[PDB]
Amino acid sequence: YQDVNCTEVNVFQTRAGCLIGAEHVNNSYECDIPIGAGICASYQTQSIIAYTMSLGAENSVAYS
Amino acid sequence: NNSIAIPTNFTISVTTEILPVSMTKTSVDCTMYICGDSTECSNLLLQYGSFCTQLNRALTGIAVEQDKNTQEVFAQVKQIYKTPPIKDFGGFNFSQILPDPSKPSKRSFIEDLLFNKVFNGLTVLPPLLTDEMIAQYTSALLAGTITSGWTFGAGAALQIPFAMQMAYRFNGIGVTQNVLYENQKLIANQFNSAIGKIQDSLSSALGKLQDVVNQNAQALNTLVKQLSSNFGAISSVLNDILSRLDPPEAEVQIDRLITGRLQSLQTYVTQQLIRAAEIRASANLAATKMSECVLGQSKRVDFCGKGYHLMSFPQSAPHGVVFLHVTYVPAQEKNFTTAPAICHDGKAHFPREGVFVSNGTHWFVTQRNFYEPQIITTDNTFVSGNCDVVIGIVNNTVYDPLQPELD
Amino acid sequence: FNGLTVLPPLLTDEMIAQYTSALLAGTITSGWTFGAGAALQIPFAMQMAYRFNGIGVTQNVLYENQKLIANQFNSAIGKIQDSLSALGKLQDVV
Amino acid sequence: NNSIAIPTNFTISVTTEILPVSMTKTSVDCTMYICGDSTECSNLLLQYGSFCTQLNRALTGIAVEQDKNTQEVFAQVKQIYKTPPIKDFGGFNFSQIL
Amino acid sequence: LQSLQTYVTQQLIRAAEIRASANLAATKMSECVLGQSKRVDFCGKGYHL
Numbered sequence: 001y002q003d004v005n006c007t008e009v010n011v012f013q014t015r016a017g018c019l020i021g022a023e024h025v026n027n028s029y030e031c032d033i034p035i036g037a038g039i040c041a042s043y044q045t046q047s048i049i050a051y052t053m054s055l056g057a058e059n060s061v062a063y064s
Numbered sequence: 065n066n067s068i069a070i071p072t073n074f075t076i077s078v079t080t081e082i083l084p085v086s087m088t089k090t091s092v093d094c095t096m097y098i099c100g101d102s103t104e105c106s107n108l109l110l111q112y113g114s115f116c117t118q119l120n121r122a123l124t125g126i127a128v129e130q131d132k133n134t135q136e137v138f139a140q141v142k143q144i145y146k147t148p149p150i151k152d153f154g155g156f157n158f159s160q161i162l163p164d165p166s167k168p169s170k171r172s173f174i175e176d177l178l179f180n181k182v183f184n185g186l187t188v189l190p191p192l193l194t195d196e197m198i199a200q201y202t203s204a205l206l207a208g209t210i211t212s213g214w215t216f217g218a219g220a221a222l223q224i225p226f227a228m229q230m231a232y233r234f235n236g237i238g239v240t241q242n243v244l245y246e247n248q249k250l251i252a253n254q255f256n257s258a259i260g261k262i263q264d265s266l267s268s269a270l271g272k273l274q275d276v277v278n279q280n281a282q283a284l285n286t287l288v289k290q291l292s293s294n295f296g297a298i299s300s301v302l303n304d305i306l307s308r309l310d311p312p313e314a315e316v317q318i319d320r321l322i323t324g325r326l327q328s329l330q331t332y333v334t335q336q337l338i339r340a341a342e343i344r345a346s347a348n349l350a351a352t353k354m355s356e357c358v359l360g361q362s363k364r365v366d367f368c369g370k371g372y373h374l375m376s377f378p379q380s381a382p383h384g385v386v387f388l389h390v391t392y393v394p395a396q397e398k399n400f401t402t403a404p405a406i407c408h409d410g411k412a413h414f415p416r417e418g419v420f421v422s423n424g425t426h427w428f429v430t431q432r433n434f435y436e437p438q439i440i441t442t443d444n445t446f447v448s449g450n451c452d453v454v455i456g457i458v459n460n461t462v463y464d465p466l467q468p469e470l471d
Numbered sequence: 472f473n474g475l476t477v478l479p480p481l482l483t484d485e486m487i488a489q490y491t492s493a494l495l496a497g498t499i500t501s502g503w504t505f506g507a508g509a510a511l512q513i514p515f516a517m518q519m520a521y522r523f524n525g526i527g528v529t530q531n532v533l534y535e536n537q538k539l540i541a542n543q544f545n546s547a548i549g550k551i552q553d554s555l556s557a558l559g560k561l562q563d564v565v
Numbered sequence: 566n567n568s569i570a571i572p573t574n575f576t577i578s579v580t581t582e583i584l585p586v587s588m589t590k591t592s593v594d595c596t597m598y599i600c601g602d603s604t605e606c607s608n609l610l611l612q613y614g615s616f617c618t619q620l621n622r623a624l625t626g627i628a629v630e631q632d633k634n635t636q637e638v639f640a641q642v643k644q645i646y647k648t649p650p651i652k653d654f655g656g657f658n659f660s661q662i663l
Numbered sequence: 664l665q666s667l668q669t670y671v672t673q674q675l676i677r678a679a680e681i682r683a684s685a686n687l688a689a690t691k692m693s694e695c696v697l698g699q700s701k702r703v704d705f706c707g708k709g710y711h712l
């Protein structure tokens with residue numbers, strides 16, 4: 001639900017609005033379905049999860 | 065016909081360039097804009113076909129294209145490179161452009177300056193990428209280009225000392241490495257001063273980014289103000305028409321509002337489509353500029369700044385990208401006398417990579433973009449033909465290195 | 472007409488001609504040096520030698536065929552005006 | 566697999582390329598075109614909102630963009646250079662273009 | 664009003680096309696006149712001088 005507070009309609013509240021049916025996780029994966037404001041939805045396993053998209057693998061160049 | 069001018073010094077100058085990449089994503093709803101939640105208006109509008117489906121489809125397309133533009137402009141890296149904790153770049157100072165942990169959203173100083181410089185059926189969709197993530201892309205690009213040159217733009221990033229990277233760039237712009245290696249401190253000081261000047265100028269310019277925001281706000285305000293026009297009817301309020309008349313003649317006063325509001329909405333959608341096309345062209349140009357000036361060195365004239373392009377830095381903006389083009393500008397020229405080739409022992413000698421210059425008595429060989437005279441030998445020249453066909457030949461000796469050392 | 476107005480361009484035609492003449496003079500005299508900063512004079516033959524050096528041809532070829540190159544260039548320039556005396560792309564907009 | 570061709574001569578060719586850069590800047594008075602200076606028509610047109618304002622804004626934007634295009638295309642030089650009175654260009658003749 | 668709106672829309676589209684052409688012309692000037700271009704068939708047919 002876009003730009004709607006979750007009290008006006010398991011249940012997760014994001015900047016893009018209120019999201020129902022997705023489980024918020026602490027992981028960070030690549031974006032499968034773009035939700036908005038840095039949030040994406042994917043189907044892991046059997047269920048739907050909502051996370052923060054990961055920009056990419058971290059890398060530090062051995063510079064001297 | 066026998067005079068040339070060659071610079072003896074140079075100045076490192078950094079200039080800015082601002083390109084809009086995206087605009088605000090907006091969506092509208094007919095059933096609440098034209099009708100304002102009234103059943104009879106929807107019943108009458110149902111007779112008009114499926115214009116509103118087309119309008120919604122167009123708005124959705126132009127909203128998706130904005131995220132597509134942002135992704136193609138900024139997401140040009142695979143890894144997220146990080147600057148090493150120790151920063152020893154041969155005297156160069158990137159403190160004003162590198163991310164600051166204490167600053168909000170981990171933005172840089174110049175990024176913070178740039179960011180500080182600048183209902184009823186209408187909704188605004190937030191962008192897919194937030195400001196923090198765009199700033200992280202910019203920081204990754206900056207770290208990669210600082211610590212790897214252009215190698216990371218073609219595959220795995222390969223580390224290299226920064227002084228050697230700038231020596232590579234100098235060689236690319238036609239100046240030998242010894243010129244850079246013997247002037248490292250001066251180049252670093254000039255670069256630092258030029259960087260500070262950009263900060264000073266910005267702290268005191270972003271018209272192109274302001275223009276799109278102003279145009280979008282003006283269009284939305286005009287669309288909202290169009291709701292208070294009767295279009296030659298009794299009033300601009302649906303409820304006034306409803307609860308003052310029965311519906312055999314009130315239905316005639318309603319359709320006029322319907323067609324007026326539909327015309328206004330179609331005009332707004334067409335203007336938005338044209339503006340989105342122009343923004344897409346600008347975003348394509350910005351992506352090309354990023355790929356050709358940041359991930360590499362461009363030989364195109366006046367494409368990555370004014371002068372001989374060395375290397376560029378990107379910076380995030382509210383709805384755009386700011387480039388810091390570092391260019392090589394020659395200065396302090398003195399003009400000499402010149403000959404196309406030298407005749408010696410009946411043979412014409414041409415310079416391998418430079419030109420023949422004379423200060424009045426002696427002849428030398430120097431590179432074209434920097435004054436550095438050398439003694440004319442057989443190692444920096446090649447022989448072709450005899451000295452009776454080329455016009456402008458002068459008489460001089462060519463120093464053969466082998467003869468004196470052998471004897 | 473009835474409410475139609477044609478605004479005059481800001482840059483008058485002789486001003487554009489002056490820009491073009493300045494560009495031609497800079498190209499002929501300083502080569503490409505004036506495009507990056509201060510104009511640096513250089514004999515035209517050596518600039519053309521530079522330009523051949525840029526396309527993978529040794530500069531001695533120009534210094535051995537200058538007369539032929541100049542004659543061919545003059546003949547081509549003369550042929551251009553005969554070909555002109557086309558502009559459909561400009562006419563279409565009008 | 567063992568044959569190559571190498572040129573032994575060359576020709577100098579000049580070709581013309583033509584590109585439009587600007588249009589004719591036109592501005593249309595919405596009220597006088599629509600109504601032809603009649604008060605009643607203006608009064609009825611006032612009921613239609615601010616369409617004429619948007620039309621004039623678009624036309625003015627186009628007119629400004631034309632001058633911006635011309636300035637970008639041509640104003641790429643800082644100083645007005647002048648050719649020397651002599652024409653010692655190594656046998657090259659630029660009389661037709663100077 | 665309908666005729667005027669149609670005229671304005673067509674003028675806007677034509678102006679966008681002309682602006683694209685003018686950008687191409689400016690790039691061609693900067694890359695063929697102020698320097699030597701290595702791009703194939705960008706500054707004429709053959710090897711640009």
Ligand SMILES: *[C@@H]1O[C@H](CO)[C@@H](O[C@@H]2O[C@H](CO)[C@@H](O)[C@H](O)[C@H]2NC(C)=O)[C@H](O)[C@H]1NC(C)=O
Pocket residue numbers: 072073074250253254396
């Ligand atoms: C090339 O230019 C630089 C700066 O434009 C010159 O360095 C300056 O030298 C003067 C003379 O002592 C100092 O007062 C300035 O502080 C120097 N500037 C900087 C930034 O260090 C340099 O001397 C010039 N080189 C030649 C050969 O003329």
Ligand SMILES: *[C@@H]1O[C@H](CO)[C@@H](O[C@@H]2O[C@H](CO)[C@@H](O)[C@H](O)[C@H]2NC(C)=O)[C@H](O)[C@H]1NC(C)=O
Pocket residue numbers: 157158159160
């Ligand atoms: C790079 O430049 C920055 C300023 O742009 C330097 O940071 C400042 O340095 C001065 C001089 O000691 C300090 O007084 C300030 O507290 C520093 N921080 C600011 C102004 O925010 C930085 O030191 C320079 N880098 C190096 C290696 O010297």
Ligand SMILES: *[C@@H]1O[C@H](CO)[C@@H](O[C@@H]2O[C@H](CO)[C@@H](O)[C@H](O)[C@H]2NC(C)=O)[C@H](O)[C@H]1NC(C)=O
Pocket residue numbers: 397398399
């Ligand atoms: C290059 O040489 C020319 C030839 O003398 C110099 O041009 C003259 O400079 C003087 C000094 O300002 C002027 O009064 C003359 O009008 C110039 N033109 C002439 C004499 O035709 C020029 O100064 C030299 N370039 C440099 C950088 O010293």
Ligand SMILES: *[C@@H]1O[C@H](CO)[C@@H](O[C@@H]2O[C@H](CO)[C@@H](O)[C@H](O)[C@H]2NC(C)=O)[C@H](O)[C@H]1NC(C)=O
Pocket residue numbers: 423424425426
């Ligand atoms: C032109 O450059 C030559 C470089 O050899 C100069 O000749 C030398 O000048 C120095 C400086 O006075 C003398 O110590 C040497 O004895 C000279 N000869 C040699 C072989 O080095 C010459 O003076 C310069 N001329 C001008 C007008 O600058």
Ligand SMILES: *[C@@H]1O[C@H](CO)[C@@H](O[C@@H]2O[C@H](CO)[C@@H](O)[C@H](O)[C@H]2NC(C)=O)[C@H](O)[C@H]1NC(C)=O
Pocket residue numbers: 458459
């Ligand atoms: C360059 O040197 C050659 C030979 O050292 C000069 O050619 C001689 O010129 C004189 C006078 O014109 C003649 O008397 C000789 O017969 C020539 N000898 C040969 C072998 O050609 C030539 O003139 C010199 N060029 C300049 C410009 O001084």
Ligand SMILES: *[C@@H]1O[C@H](CO)[C@@H](O[C@@H]2O[C@H](CO)[C@@H](O)[C@H](O)[C@H]2NC(C)=O)[C@H](O)[C@H]1NC(C)=O
Pocket residue numbers: 539542543573574575
């Ligand atoms: C290369 O081409 C040029 C011109 O295309 C040739 O020069 C011509 O030679 C013929 C034969 O004598 C003359 O009749 C023409 O007048 C010449 N053209 C010009 C413009 O002068 C040249 O012979 C060819 N071959 C070589 C090796 O240069």
Ligand SMILES: *[C@@H]1O[C@H](CO)[C@@H](O[C@@H]2O[C@H](CO)[C@@H](O)[C@H](O)[C@H]2NC(C)=O)[C@H](O)[C@H]1NC(C)=O
Pocket residue numbers: 652658659660661
């Ligand atoms: C440069 O070319 C022009 C023509 O494009 C030459 O002017 C012509 O010269 C011939 C004689 O060579 C005359 O018969 C014509 O009447 C001239 N046409 C004019 C003046 O319009 C000019 O002479 C050439 N320049 C050089 C230095 O040869």
Ligand SMILES: *[C@@H]1O[C@H](CO)[C@@H](O)[C@H](O)[C@H]1NC(C)=O
Pocket residue numbers: 005006007013
């Ligand atoms: C949504 O409603 C809750 C409950 O009143 C409130 O605390 C919160 O501020 C509202 N807004 C958001 C964005 O959660």
Ligand SMILES: *[C@@H]1O[C@H](CO)[C@@H](O)[C@H](O)[C@H]1NC(C)=O
Pocket residue numbers: 024025026
């Ligand atoms: C995610 O991590 C936070 C810690 O910042 C924790 O409070 C929260 O319970 C975690 N949620 C899940 C679903 O693991």
Ligand SMILES: *[C@@H]1O[C@H](CO)[C@@H](O)[C@H](O)[C@H]1NC(C)=O
Pocket residue numbers: 065066455456457653
């Ligand atoms: C240069 O021009 C002068 C005329 O001032 C002439 O005497 C000389 O022969 C010319 N030299 C060349 C190489 O063109």
